[PDB]
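Following up on my earlier message about 3PE. Here are the inputs again, as you asked, copied directly from the submission form:
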Amino acid sequence: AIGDYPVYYKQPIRWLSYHAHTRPHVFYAIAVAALGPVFMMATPLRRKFLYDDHEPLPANGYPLPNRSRDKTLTGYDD
Amino acid sequence: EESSESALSKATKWYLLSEIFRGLYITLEMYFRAPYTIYYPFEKGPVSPRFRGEH
Amino acid sequence: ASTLTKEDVLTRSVSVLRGFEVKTKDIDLQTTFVQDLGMDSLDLNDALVALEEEFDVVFDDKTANEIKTVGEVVDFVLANYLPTEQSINHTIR
Amino acid sequence: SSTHTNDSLNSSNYVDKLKDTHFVFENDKLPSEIPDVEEVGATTAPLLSAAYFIGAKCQDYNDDFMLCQKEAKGNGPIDCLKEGRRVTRCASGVLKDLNTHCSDEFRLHWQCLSFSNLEYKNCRKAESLLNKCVFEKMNLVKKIPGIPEDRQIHLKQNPVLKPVALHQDSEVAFKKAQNENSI
Amino acid sequence: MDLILLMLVAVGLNIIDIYIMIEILIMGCTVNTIYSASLDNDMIGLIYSLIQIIIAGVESAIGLSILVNYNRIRNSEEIE
Amino acid sequence: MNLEILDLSILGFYSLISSNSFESIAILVATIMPVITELWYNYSQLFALLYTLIYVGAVVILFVFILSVINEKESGLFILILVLLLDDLDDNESNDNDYNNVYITDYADWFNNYNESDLSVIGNLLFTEYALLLLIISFILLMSIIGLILIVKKD
Amino acid sequence: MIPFEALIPYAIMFAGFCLGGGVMNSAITADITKRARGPNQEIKRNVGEDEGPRNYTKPRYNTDQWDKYFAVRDLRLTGSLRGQSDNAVAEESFKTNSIQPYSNTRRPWVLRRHIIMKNSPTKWARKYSSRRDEREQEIKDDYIRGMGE
Amino acid sequence: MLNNLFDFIEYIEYWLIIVAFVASVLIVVAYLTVAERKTMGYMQRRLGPNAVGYYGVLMAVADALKLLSKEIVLPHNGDIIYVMSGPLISLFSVLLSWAVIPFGPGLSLLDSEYSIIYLLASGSIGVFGTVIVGWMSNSKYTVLATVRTTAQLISYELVLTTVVFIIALIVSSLNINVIIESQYNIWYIIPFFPLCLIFFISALAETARPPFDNVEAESELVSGHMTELSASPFVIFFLSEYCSMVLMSTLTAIFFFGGYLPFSNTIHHLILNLFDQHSIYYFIIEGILLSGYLAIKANFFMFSFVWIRAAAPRLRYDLLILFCWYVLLPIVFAIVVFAPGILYCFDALPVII
Amino acid sequence: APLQQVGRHGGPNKCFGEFQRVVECMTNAKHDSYEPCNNLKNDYLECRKHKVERYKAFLMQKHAEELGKDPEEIGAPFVRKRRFLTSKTLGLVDGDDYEIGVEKI
Ligand SMILES: CCCCCCCCCCCCCCCCCC(=O)OC[C@H](COP(=O)(O)OCCN)OC(=O)CCCCCCCCCCCCCCCCC
Ligand SMILES: CCCCCCCCCCCCCCCCCC(=O)OC[C@H](COP(=O)(O)OCCN)OC(=O)CCCCCCCCCCCCCCCCC
Ligand SMILES: CCCCCCCCCCCC(=O)OC[C@H](COP(=O)(O)OCC[N+](C)(C)C)OC(=O)CCCCCCCCCCC
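Thanks, got it. Here's what our run produced:
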């Protein structure tokens, strides 16, 4: 095995190294893109050990109180 | 499999343009050196007593 | 397609032949070239090249020394006539 | 956002030319049976400055006006005019109060906002002066609902986003009160 | 004066000219959609317009790819 | 004096006298530009830009790319003018006379305190509400990438 | 050994941006502030003896759809798109000076005047077929037939 | 008359603002040509043009006046259109791209939430403007470098466009002012250093500047596409090329180096502390500082454009297409997904304030 | 059910409220037929196009002619140029007819 092409289901570690020496533009492109999903799936670790999420922004119009109109309201009349 | 510099070492030189940036710096060295230019006709280049010119 | 027939070659052949010094103005299939028209090497080449310019058919080196009659040239054009390939604009639009 | 609509002035006079837009006045007034009210006469900078102080003083009246809209079932403009005057009168109350009680601090704030693109993050120093003066004359406290008390943005001691250019009057008034009031 | 099919005169006399006319025609349907979406103040219609621009883009590529292969075919002798 | 009309009258002329593939390509650009400009004013500014970035920036410079690989070979004036003048008599694509010659207005409302660009709404709907449209369009673009290679690549 | 001769062109290029930035910043700020001074030219250009320090107003960027309503509101209050007025009660003119743009809703000229872009099966029906209008005319006619009953 | 004069300027002031703006760009563009030879001179131990105007300052004007007053070569008597469309479209495309560059807070002629798209759209038109140059004007050297040209500035327009969008993804805005003002606490050269290299590499190739200079391959295509062009058609096109070098230098400073933002806020406040804010003199100095802050940043890349030209040989054309597609595109398509993943993981999805 | 008529800010536009009442009327279980929802559908198309309303304006313009009425005395005064929304026209007490600033906000 002086320079043989590694077999992917027999030598997974050596198969990665072949495409890390001879095709640098392919190996390190995927690795940078791999951190995207990897960090996304690590969010549930952050929700408990670093800080909790912010409250959702009030982007639904004027917040309408969940009640009925107050009849007794007076003042600022005509 | 017989390369001294590891895959990461070769990739960093390759991706970060190590030799080009060195090539740029050496050019920038010459920017802070005195140019060879002389100002004709206010100055002339050297001549030798054996110079062959106008008959 | 090849729209030339035998008569069409024969009819237009005479007009080219009427344009060059010919001993007799009567030329048909049986008429020869060197004998009837009294044409030597250089004289005969101009008429043969002239028919190449009108019939648009190239005569090779094999037939060069083997041409003896004017009917052969008329029959030769039919066996060797094709329309020039038309560009994509002319063909389909 | 800045999309051409049919309700307000568009980007350029060429847009008005292509649409043949006519700007139409109405010379009438409200019919006599509808009671009269004095409209609020403040522009953008005063209101953005006083938006939270108007909220504190008129909180019960903002909600009733908006609740009236929901209970009008699409007939809001005709069935909530009486409630509409309550909000206007309460809003005029705060602008008048800020004019006779905290007049100096008020102008210092919204003039800073006019100086710095109406962005709330560029006038913290002119705002801390106004909040302290209002709390000592009108009992109105600025509050941003939804988050804890100690996470409200205007109380952050080292905000990450500071103005590029410092307002001079804001700095002078802050330092003038830096040693006098805040010994 | 459209019922006399006047637009056929305005088309060029090559296959590439036919391709242009189609894209102009498809562009007419997008400008109408943007006209309808904006006046109604609807963003669902503007989504349709975005899809029309994208879809009509792909059709342009496939058409020219076929035309280029077709044109290469005539000059595909490759003797040297 | 809508100067938009004059430009189309010119384009309605060079389209009839177009001879070679240079003229037809220039018709496409001379059609896009009145489209882009009349959209920049009037109706929608976002899609006036989205035309330029996609139409001109992707397809039109690909039109002239392939055209250089295709070929370059080779009534009167009163008829062309007569055709245009009669074609110009009627220019009302609709026939609702009340809807054309009467102007309208809309009343602004202050409820939308969360003002956002028209592109943000499109993203807020195309990526959530109508995700299937987005994922099919990706699938179509995948077909073209494989489609374009198989047609052209000889081997 | 810093060659100052080569730095001469960059100084002018440095002054190239300065002229644009210096004029644009000072002119735009000066004009905006001047138009907020009042509803008339007689007070815009006349510096007051009884006024305080001049407070400027830098141009606004990153505007949204509310600012368009705000600008019109300030125009109807102080005769300028960025006027300054913090009076409690607006003027009597403000009550009945609202401005409402009325415009047309016709299709773009390029849609209905291109020699090619105006031809489609549905556009010809709109332009040369009465079938769409005959139905939609009945609704309009019913508005006046259904009044007296 | 003083009443008809003071209001007259009120009717003409904004036109003068544009004229002042127009001259501001042209002065930088004009003296970039002079600065190129000087910078490329000393780097090569030359001297550069110092004998046309005092210390060579009047060098660009000499070339402009010389070229504008030459005979114009035309295919026929009245055939000016062919030798003018190519230069004119290229010039207008890059001149209109200056309508969005902000010299300070809101100091832009065009301010809209779609500044990036308008900036990128105007770039496409200039791309189409160039391919007209090598079209149908015979076929000797211009049409050789038109399929070559088109296949180059098409491909890198993908990589340049993606880089712009990745920056706009971080701020969630397409407004250049928002992009500039959002770099207060950080300059995108720090997090997005690879993108700045990728942007500049694409910036060079789009403008056809060397090392990616096979459009006008001097040793291969004589003058490239401008071998037919002479006199005014050459001036317009040459002026078009350098406006891109100024624009792409400015854009790099706007996106990655914070735009007009000061190098230090401490020094910035000290200088502005000396001028009373109630006098217009404050706002003249303020514009100079912010524009000068943008100019110094934009200068370094204008210096960098000459710097790279004087130290790197030309790149073989076939390896240019195999570069962006095989190398630059996968990287720029990876950071376009690496950025949202990090921002969402720590709950920092951007908003427009 | 999928959204239709979404305004430019992400919420319902002008004519969505009239669109919802059509959907509620049609899908309700109490209706034997779709006859009740005929007026609700006529209002939705009225909202989008105002065709009936524009017709009523055509008659009023046409009818004002036959009595000799002049639009100057019945019509609504309007200003056609956006730079000439002068403070005198706006009704400001001290205002003067000079052009207003619309060059740059
Ligand atoms: C910046 C404006 C510059 C305008 C330069 C050309 C001006 C002539 C008017 C053309 C514009 C009218 C719209 C029609 C599109 C052009 C179609 C055409 O036929 O152009 C003809 C042009 C002039 O040649 P001519 O003698 O008149 O015609 C016979 C030529 N054997 O011969 C040609 O083939 C044109 C050669 C140059 C092609 C450059 C690309 C076309 C122009 C794109 C920019 C113009 C945008 C459209 C502006 C008008 C909009 C209506
Ligand atoms: C300044 C004015 C400018 C106007 C621009 C257009 C100029 C006219 C151009 C030709 C016009 C012919 C078509 C006319 C419009 C189309 C027909 C139509 O819409 O109806 C109009 C006319 C009469 O309709 P009418 O009875 O009045 O309807 C009232 C109902 N309340 O309907 C008719 O009776 C017209 C007669 C048509 C029947 C004979 C022609 C049809 C047979 C030949 C068709 C050609 C081949 C097509 C084959 C079809 C392909 C499968
Ligand atoms: C995650 C890391 C992110 C990094 C982002 C930056 C990547 C940039 C490109 C790296 C790959 C590369 O330059 O490659 C080099 C490519 C392709 O070389 P190749 O065909 O593979 O031959 C090499 C084969 N080897 C592997 C056996 C060695 O050609 C070149 O010489 C391109 C030269 C570009 C010069 C640009 C100068 C601009 C200067 C700007 C500042 C003044």
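One observation from looking it over: The CA atoms of residues 2 and 82 of chain C lie 6 Å apart. Hope that helps, and feel free to reply on this thread.
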